[PDB]
Design a protein around this ligand. Structure first.
Ligand SMILES: CC(C)(COP(=O)(O)OP(=O)(O)OC[C@H]1O[C@@H](n2cnc3c(N)ncnc32)[C@H](O)[C@@H]1OP(=O)(O)O)[C@@H](O)C(=O)NCCC(=O)NCCS
Ligand SMILES: CC(C)(COP(=O)(O)OP(=O)(O)OC[C@H]1O[C@@H](n2cnc3c(N)ncnc32)[C@H](O)[C@@H]1OP(=O)(O)O)[C@@H](O)C(=O)NCCC(=O)NCCS
Ligand SMILES: CC(C)(COP(=O)(O)OP(=O)(O)OC[C@H]1O[C@@H](n2cnc3c(N)ncnc32)[C@H](O)[C@@H]1OP(=O)(O)O)[C@@H](O)C(=O)NCCC(=O)NCCS
Ligand SMILES: CC(C)(COP(=O)(O)OP(=O)(O)OC[C@H]1O[C@@H](n2cnc3c(N)ncnc32)[C@H](O)[C@@H]1OP(=O)(O)O)[C@@H](O)C(=O)NCCC(=O)NCCS
Lengths: 257, 257, 258, 257, 259, 257
């Protein structure tokens, strides 16, 4: 309910998670990652919640991992540290409920890596995005080497990771790093409209779409197609499917409960 | 050569398959899938045919699939239903001859899934594309969860499948969902020009290209590269290679029989 | 360092490899492939070199490959010839040091395949890229069928391979085949700028980024992620990491000496 | 349903396909492969058939592909010939009904590839198995390079393919190439006993087991697991599940109608 | 630390988890899974623990998933139920510390799937193992369709899942389903011997071995090899490596402390 | 021709590589690895050589990497060291000519990893095999964690790697770690017999089998099968295939030139 480093708001079917360390530009530290994990678990457990939005308080969405940790890591501890925080990102990606990253400002390092773990990214024009970990003599340790490459392609991902350069929102849109950009002033509203569209749909169909997409993409195409087919069987069994098929024939809007 | 729900036309080495249920916006039903399957096998079997083109009659390319069994399908029958329909799409994808989807209008749900099975998509500016299965409380069941994701990336494919929203032709082109958009008035001409270029080329080279590209993409890069090299040996044995090489060396336009 | 078909130039920590057969539009032949292999081996061996840039002399980056032998190859010999040339491309892709293809002109057939093996591509607006092998009754045999498809997607790669038509640099940028295009007049300057930015960074971190990205991309995502995490432990053992973390805490600019 | 090179017999819910070219040791020619394809399709569509068993007439199971075809083919035709035959094997492997190869004798080259395509292999002690294609200056072309390697491991597979040496049934059992070996005199009864036990189970459960095993094995373990879980949801909607669960609850034998 | 359905015992470096529902042959119910989960998380958290052993009290290791659950589930609920239970098995498989299944008797369905999630299996000759889920009109839903097939091969895994027939310990050993079998009377001794050998090794090296083997097996061979190499970097940073290499050069016995 | 740490002998078609550091049980130092690489590359390039055999001088096959190298390595140097040595193993594995490891005695750590890189392993009953790296506070770094677990299975491989314990020849054979075990006194003759058999066969066919098997095993099955088919194309172009098929048809022994 109440957290040191984040704020949570339940708004009907919408769960809003705001990173709340604005003095440190929402830098991810051990506590914030622990709290973000809990919040996301809360949301997944609570059947009122249908869509989760992550955003940042103030100027930054997230400026990265908290560097103060780093000077006292053994290599073996560094491995475990990277794996631990990255596993929080992996949980978010595998969530059975849709997730949106609303990028209001800087999304750098750990910050962009969190955004990459969400299903959909919507950014402000004023947002700046990057993986500046190479500037510290290291490299992205929260999934960025895998997720950025897959999203914008190897050449652009390598140039961003090797130089550490930030790109503007409009460039992120161009490369497909974010689904679209809008002025900061329109961001909350554009995000709310998307989330509310999704929050109307069948929770079970949404969970199956995510499972089938995520698991299928990692597999050979025939194995992903087989997963899609078997899952279609499961969705077909549901009350929301019945509601949906009957709303269509009766020319009304379905209520997917 | 004579069908209830489709029309076929052989023009030289071009084979045109037109979905023909314009009153239902060319919606896919049991009968249409069965005929499409037969038409494609004939085209693949006919040695005069070098390129296949699939398009729709009327306002739509294909606006969806019939919902008329969905009341008498058990979950297990729904699994087999999904698989049976999708496997026809897989057969088009795996044809030894180039296929082009000429998207003249709505390409929605099953219809977009069919277009995604073709090698190349050319669309009309006026075309609308999407996967609205979520609106019925189900999800795409003819390969959309796998092929859309792979073509436009996960962020945009998830947004499209979770909202059900249609996108105009020009957005499809921006996202790489179609190769080109042109005004509907120039669609048949643009398509024909492409088809005619490909039909000039060695059928055996085209067949090997499709095999190594499709099979190689699903493998580790070194395995796909090994497939490319061994196929290169095969294409080097061909009559069209001898013609092609000696045509260039003797400064002459080659004829590929 | 004295080669027949290529020129090599060491400029600080930058190594420039220029294909040098302008009369034949820098066409790849057995000799050029052999020298390029040797030059790239040299660059990788030399600890003063941080970044390798490949480019072409004259109007072409690389306009194709030598077709002279093609009418005298057996199918089994053709398989081996394909494998031999392509393995030099694979070697460039797997290099421990960042590679940039500076595409100044025609990049066709083998020439596009060479560019595809580099980490990053920067092209002139004037450049034209294509795989016209289909026009000889064959198909790309130095990795194009795999690499182009992965880069610009199946639909556009198949159209390019099936028709054999070239695309302008602006289209290549739109498809993601190159990172960006600039006017040819500004191409060297823009490439040097990128190379110099990369050459300032930790060589061990750059080597780890390439290994993790290349190997991770070929695996299921969890396996790529596991590779990224273990690699992070290796990057934390370096002096460059100590320097970079120091520098950030002391609000000063790091110097990555290696 | 009446064939030249094969005999088909339906015994209750068992479908027996017996290769019938005893003079040529059941060697696979274009006609046999054509008829085998038609026979398996026939069995799969017939809802009375639950289990398919493939065996050979006379002393051999199958002594390979027919070598009289080989010296006619160009290299491009040889690629298409390999693909054509092997795709029939693939279809057998992908069948929604359980398949058993009853290896009564010689299973060499194409014949071993045919056996590898089935779900389960039972052989006679007297059976000899191998891939002697290298003795013709070629190598296995109907899947042996892939299926044998996966079944008996690379070391033993490479030794067999590089030497062309045959192994006895007992060695095949030891290496896991067959499930069981029994004297030829007991082979039909051992096979019948296995087929009858399988024929009693839920056909839908058996179809889902095969799909999730075959597709799952080809995927990353998490994708295979996800496929197993969605399939479990489909199997829970079946009438045979209701029967089976109540039978354990009621301490009575179940009947899978 | 005190559980309704399991017993946990911490003998030095070793953590023994014993399934404790002998009247129902250690059948997995929702409570047992929750408790097993907690116990495995505990052992994982605790640096004093180096090796985890799982076994069953009584006649059976584990006779299956509690079938009384299965009556009420909609297809969607059944999907979720499979995934939830199987995700616990996944967690055991992915644990950073070595796990041994000590299979003292019946390992059926859920029971065998639990065994398959452990790193190493040692069984009594007297043990019976199988996946009898097909007898209930269903199929293995806690990972058996994927893990059994990968361990004993597709032919025999299909035969086992399609027939539901159980196999004796010695057949399990022949197929590679267990590492070895010994008489039940020597089973605890054989298991302790193995566990104590592993427990004296570098914890960081063992954690890396498991990560590299598990992640590498699921990848193309070159990617797994890449992961092996980069991990070698990490293991060469440890105090235990210095000790081990020192000990060999000095022709003496190393003591690994896992700093 | 002449090396410091290995001996080589060319007998007809066979090339024998004998590790020659018997005072250190053939432990792999930088020098031995460099010379082994050079010898296998020479053998690959020499058209007279058809089969390569690797064996050890004295008591041992090979007792692993030379441990005197290890306390000089930094972590980043250790990464590099692993990759360098293992890439020599990779090269042996991918060689275009058949390789046999004749395991005369101890094959531990790097020695077992070297044996695992060869196509076929024949061991003496007296041979002891293992991966005792864990005994040194490290783990296998020349590919053992991947190759051993693919060959004998995860449970047996994890137990050997975690305990460091050695197994005798006969258990190696049980596990499929070696093809065959014979007494040391018969080992050279058993190895020679196998080698001479393989050296009779088509060099091009043997190269294609190795490429198709190694690359195919690493792929989804359908991609492996596609590779086998196109390769069959290439092997049908060879003089040796013409000789083999016409030899069989002409009822005579083939001579594979
Ligand atoms: C984002 C940026 C471009 C614009 O910020 P700016 O206007 O320079 O203001 P700062 O971000 O320096 O100031 C905000 C505070 O948060 C801190 N902060 C920012 N990112 C941080 C991180 N990843 N970890 C810990 N602290 C961080 C700053 O050091 C500063 O703290 P201080 O003023 O109390 O010392 C700038 O912060 C930048 O250079 N980023 C470096 C931060 C970073 O960690 N980059 C690597 C991410 S892996
Ligand atoms: C199978 C085996 C070793 C038995 O040998 P055997 O006991 O001497 O019996 P035969 O060789 O007389 O075989 C019986 C008949 O079947 C034929 N036959 C066997 N395998 C055949 C094949 N793969 N293709 C065509 N015909 C075949 C023989 O030519 C012979 O016919 P004939 O009596 O009209 O001349 C032997 O037949 C053999 O070597 N077959 C070839 C197997 C092979 O190469 N398979 C690879 C498939 S590409
Ligand atoms: C293991 C087995 C062969 C032992 O047979 P047995 O020695 O006659 O023992 P019982 O059948 O009396 O079983 C002992 C008790 O444990 C219970 N039990 C055993 N396995 C169970 C399971 N998977 N779910 C629920 N309860 C189970 C039995 O119902 C019985 O309960 P009761 O004594 O309160 O009536 C038998 O319990 C069995 O067949 N279980 C497997 C169930 C199955 O088909 N699949 C597993 C699904 S994951
Ligand atoms: C194989 C072994 C059991 C045989 O024992 P043995 O018959 O007593 O023979 P020794 O131990 O005396 O070995 C003979 C010589 O080879 C040396 N040697 C053996 N394996 C070696 C290795 N991997 N690296 C360096 N030297 C090695 C020994 O140190 C000894 O040298 P010395 O006589 O000059 O001191 C034992 O030598 C051994 O355990 N070796 C280490 C194996 C290993 O851990 N390999 C993996 C390393 S990464």
């Amino acid at each position: 309910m109440e957290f040191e480093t984040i704020e949570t708001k339940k708004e009907g079917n919408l769960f809003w998670i705001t990173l709340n360390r604005p003095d440190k530009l929402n830098a991810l530290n051990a506590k914030l990652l622990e709290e973000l994990d809990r919040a996301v678990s809360q949301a997944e457990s609570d059947p009122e919640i249908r869509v989760i939005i992550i955003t940042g308080k103030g100027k930054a969405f997230c400026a990265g991992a908290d560097i103060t940790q780093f000077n006292q890591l053994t290599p073996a501890e560094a491995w475990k540290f990277s794996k631990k925080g990255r596993e929080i990102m992996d949980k978010i990606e595998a969530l059975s409920k849709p997730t949106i990253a609303m990028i209001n400002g800087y999304a750098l390092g750990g910050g962009l890596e969190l955004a990459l773990a969400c299903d959909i990214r919507i950014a402000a024009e004023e947002a700046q995005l990057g993986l500046p970990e190479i500037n510290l003599g290291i490299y992205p340790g929260y999934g960025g080497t895998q997720r950025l490459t897959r999203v914008i392609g190897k050449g652009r991902a390598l140039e961003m990771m090797m130089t550490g350069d930030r790109i503007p929102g409009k460039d992120a849109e161009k490369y497909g790093l974010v689904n679209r950009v809008v002025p900061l002033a329109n961001l909350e509203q554009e995000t709310r409209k998307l989330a509310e569209k999704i929050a109307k749909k069948s929770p079970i169909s949404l969970a199956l779409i995510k499972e089938v997409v995520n698991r299928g993409l990692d597999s050979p195409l025939l194995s992903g197609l087989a997963l899609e087919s078997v899952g279609w069987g499961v969705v077909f069994s549901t009350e929301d499917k019945k509601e949906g098929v009957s709303a269509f024939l009766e020319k009304r809007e379905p209520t997917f409960k």
